[PDB]
Structure formats: C-alpha cells, structure tokens
Write a protein that holds these residues in place. Sequence first.
Motif, mmCIF file in Angstrom:
data_model
loop_
_atom_site.group_PDB
_atom_site.id
_atom_site.type_symbol
_atom_site.label_atom_id
_atom_site.label_comp_id
_atom_site.label_asym_id
_atom_site.label_seq_id
_atom_site.Cartn_x
_atom_site.Cartn_y
_atom_site.Cartn_z
ATOM 1 N N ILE A 79 1.508 -0.774 -4.803
ATOM 2 C CA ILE A 79 1.607 -2.004 -5.578
ATOM 3 C C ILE A 79 0.254 -2.694 -5.507
ATOM 4 C CG2 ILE A 79 3.093 -3.987 -6.093
ATOM 5 C CD1 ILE A 79 4.551 -1.414 -6.022
ATOM 6 N N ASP A 80 -0.758 -2.060 -6.105
ATOM 7 C CA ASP A 80 -2.143 -2.503 -6.049
ATOM 8 C C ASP A 80 -2.318 -3.941 -6.531
ATOM 9 O OD1 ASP A 80 -2.819 0.134 -5.176
ATOM 10 O OD2 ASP A 80 -3.043 0.837 -7.254
ATOM 11 N N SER A 81 -1.337 -4.506 -7.230
ATOM 12 C CA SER A 81 -1.511 -5.860 -7.739
ATOM 13 C C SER A 81 -1.371 -6.886 -6.625
ATOM 14 C CB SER A 81 -0.521 -6.126 -8.874
ATOM 15 O OG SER A 81 0.792 -5.698 -8.580
ATOM 16 N N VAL A 82 -0.400 -6.685 -5.730
ATOM 17 C CA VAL A 82 -0.259 -7.556 -4.571
ATOM 18 C C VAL A 82 -1.078 -7.060 -3.402
ATOM 19 C CG1 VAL A 82 2.036 -8.148 -5.317
ATOM 20 C CG2 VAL A 82 1.701 -6.361 -3.560
ATOM 21 N N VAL A 83 -1.407 -5.768 -3.334
ATOM 22 C CA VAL A 83 -2.299 -5.337 -2.265
ATOM 23 C C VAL A 83 -3.621 -6.076 -2.369
ATOM 24 C CG1 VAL A 83 -3.444 -3.375 -1.171
ATOM 25 C CG2 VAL A 83 -1.169 -3.076 -2.101
ATOM 26 N N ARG A 84 -4.061 -6.382 -3.592
ATOM 27 C CA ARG A 84 -5.195 -7.285 -3.748
ATOM 28 C C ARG A 84 -4.814 -8.706 -3.333
ATOM 29 N NH1 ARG A 84 -7.997 -3.551 -7.110
ATOM 30 N NH2 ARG A 84 -6.316 -3.654 -8.679
ATOM 31 N N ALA A 85 -3.829 -9.300 -4.015
ATOM 32 C CA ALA A 85 -3.383 -10.655 -3.697
ATOM 33 C C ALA A 85 -3.378 -10.913 -2.193
ATOM 34 C CB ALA A 85 -1.986 -10.879 -4.286
ATOM 35 N N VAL A 129 0.829 -1.198 0.000
ATOM 36 C CA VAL A 129 0.000 0.000 0.000
ATOM 37 C C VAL A 129 0.867 1.254 0.000
ATOM 38 C CG1 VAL A 129 -1.592 1.316 1.480
ATOM 39 C CG2 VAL A 129 -1.982 -1.127 0.984
ATOM 40 N N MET A 130 1.933 1.277 0.818
ATOM 41 C CA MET A 130 2.758 2.477 0.936
ATOM 42 C C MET A 130 3.277 2.906 -0.419
ATOM 43 S SD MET A 130 1.902 2.815 3.753
ATOM 44 C CE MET A 130 2.430 4.495 4.092
#
Lengths: 130, 129
Positions: A115-121, A111-112
């Motif tokens: 990296i919205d792709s792993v923040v979802r994951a 989040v900081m």
Amino acid sequence: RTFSYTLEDHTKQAFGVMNELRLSQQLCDVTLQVKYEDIPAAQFMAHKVVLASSSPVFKAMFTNGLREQGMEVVSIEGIHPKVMERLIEFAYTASISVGEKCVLHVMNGAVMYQIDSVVRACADFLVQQL
Amino acid sequence: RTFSYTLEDHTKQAFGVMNELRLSQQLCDVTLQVKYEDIPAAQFMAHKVVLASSSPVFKAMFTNGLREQGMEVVSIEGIHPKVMERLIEFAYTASISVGEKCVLHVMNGAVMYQIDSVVRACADFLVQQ
Ligand SMILES: *C1=C(C#N)C(=O)C(C)(C)[C@@H]2CC[C@]3(C)C(=CC(=O)[C@@H]4[C@@H]5CC(C)(C)CC[C@]5(C(=O)OC)CC[C@]43C)[C@@]12C
Ligand SMILES: *C1=C(C#N)C(=O)C(C)(C)[C@@H]2CC[C@]3(C)C(=CC(=O)[C@@H]4[C@@H]5CC(C)(C)CC[C@]5(C(=O)OC)CC[C@]43C)[C@@]12C
C-alpha cells in the motif's frame, strides 16, 4: 449527435456501497485469518477484487492462476489484527487513521501489501516527528 | 492525537484496476448471458461486487440468496447486448457515451437497472434537444 455523461462522484459512492457489502459480510469471496502470536484469530471478510485494486500483493495472491477448491481462507501472520483492520479498511474507504504511536506498525503492514500510498504517508509522518 | 491520511485519487485509481481486472477476465465471478431478440447469447463477464456497487437492481440479483459462490451464469432478457455493454462501462469507467440514436434505448437499460444517474443525464439531453 453523440451524448457523453460522466458522473464524478461515482467511484466514491460505489466504494462505500462495496464497503457496506463487506460490513454486511455479503458477496465476500475471501476470508482472512489474521494470526498474531497469542491474540485470538480475527476473521476479516472481503472481496478479492477490491483488495486486489488496493494492494499489488493481493492482486498477485488471487490472480496467481493457482486456485481451485481452496484459498477462500488465507492465513495472515505477523500483522496485528487491528493494524490489518485499518489497512483492509483503507482499501474500502481510501482513508486511514491510527493513533500516532503505532504508525510504524501500520507502515510495516502496509509495506507487506505494498500500500505504497500510506507507506509514504506514514514514513513522512515518522520523519517529521524527529 | 491521531495521525490521519486520505488519498482522494484512490477511488478513481482502484476502479481503473478493477476495469483492468474485468477486461482480462481475471476475478470475474459472474457471466451475463444477454439474450435479446434473435441475437444469440452474448457473454459479459464481470464481478458481482462492482455490478452491485453501481446498480441497485444488480445487488438485488446477487444478494438474493443466490448462495452460489462459484461462477454464476445469468440470462438477461429485454436489453440489447450493446446497451448492456454501455452500462457495464459506466459501472467501471464512471462514464458512458452513445449517439442520440440510442440515447433513449440506453436510458431504458439504465432505468431497468436503477442507474438513476444516467437515467437523468439521458433524459436531460433528450429534453435539451
Ligand atoms: C496502537 C494504536 C495506537 N495509538 C492503534 O491505533 C492501533 C492501530 C489500535 C494499534 C493496534 C496494534 C497494537 C495493538 C497497538 C499498540 C501496541 O503496542 C501493540 C504491540 C506493539 C509491540 C511492539 C508492543 C508488540 C506487538 C503489539 C502487541 O502484540 O500488543 C497487542 C502489536 C499490536 C500493537 C501494535 C495499537 C493499540
Ligand atoms: C446505437 C448506438 C448509438 N449511437 C450505440 O452506441 C449502441 C448503444 C451501441 C446501440 C446498441 C443497440 C442498437 C443496436 C443500436 C442502434 C439501434 O438503432 C438498435 C435498434 C433500435 C430500434 C428501436 C431501431 C430497434 C431495436 C434495435 C435493433 O436494431 O436490434 C439489434 C435495438 C438495438 C439498437 C438500440 C446502437 C448501435
């Protein structure tokens, strides 16, 4: 006639080459000083372009139009250097592993830097455990 | 156990962002003054890193202990400014297209820069026809 070529695995292999270049401490135009409480400072070297390709937050950092004799070295507070390592690594590998017990700290780092792709994951995963 | 995650798209997506950053002259750290024939200096602005990721010859130029972290200027002989452009494109787009008029001439630049991928694909189409 007109000839066209597209090499499909080009983006894959050029990254691992770029990621080599990082591990080689070569062509690195930024060095990250990740300070986390009493843990001794860990230096992560990288290329701004790749960070900026994988983080919105980092793009704005370097393309802030405000850099000269400075900002080669950036100070990262509040991430554990080993979290930050797997983030930074994700930028260069497109993949991340983490022992599942620190998923929320890897989510919190991600989040900081958006990296919205792993923040979802990571959040999906957290929720499945409940 | 370990929680693991991969995002196949990321390599396609990130490179688009760098081609954007390229096209905006944003984090470009090198400028290729391509000086071919009597055509004047043609500037190409790019990032050493992406150049180095696609061309063995380019990585070689930069990791040649240049020791010069600032903006580098690099004079380039033997490649037409427009052939150079077609490769710089391959570097960021992963693709390239030219008429048969230049298929051989673009092949030479790819040969000059060890882009063995289009060197092959250039050759193949030459053979087909
Ligand atoms: C947890 C993992 C697991 N499983 C990992 O795979 C990591 C990525 C190697 C991860 C690195 C960050 C720490 C060191 C971590 C576990 C922790 O317990 C750590 C703590 C969390 C907390 C809430 C106890 C306080 C902060 C702290 C810490 O300061 O201890 C070193 C941050 C680092 C970490 C989240 C693993 C080993
Ligand atoms: C031919 C293309 C096609 N189709 C292109 O898409 C290129 C890649 C943009 C290419 C750039 C280089 C030149 C200008 C070119 C056409 C030519 O025929 C040019 C000639 C080739 C040759 C062997 C007849 C003599 C040298 C010359 C030239 O005329 O100097 C300017 C080199 C450049 C080029 C290969 C296209 C437009």
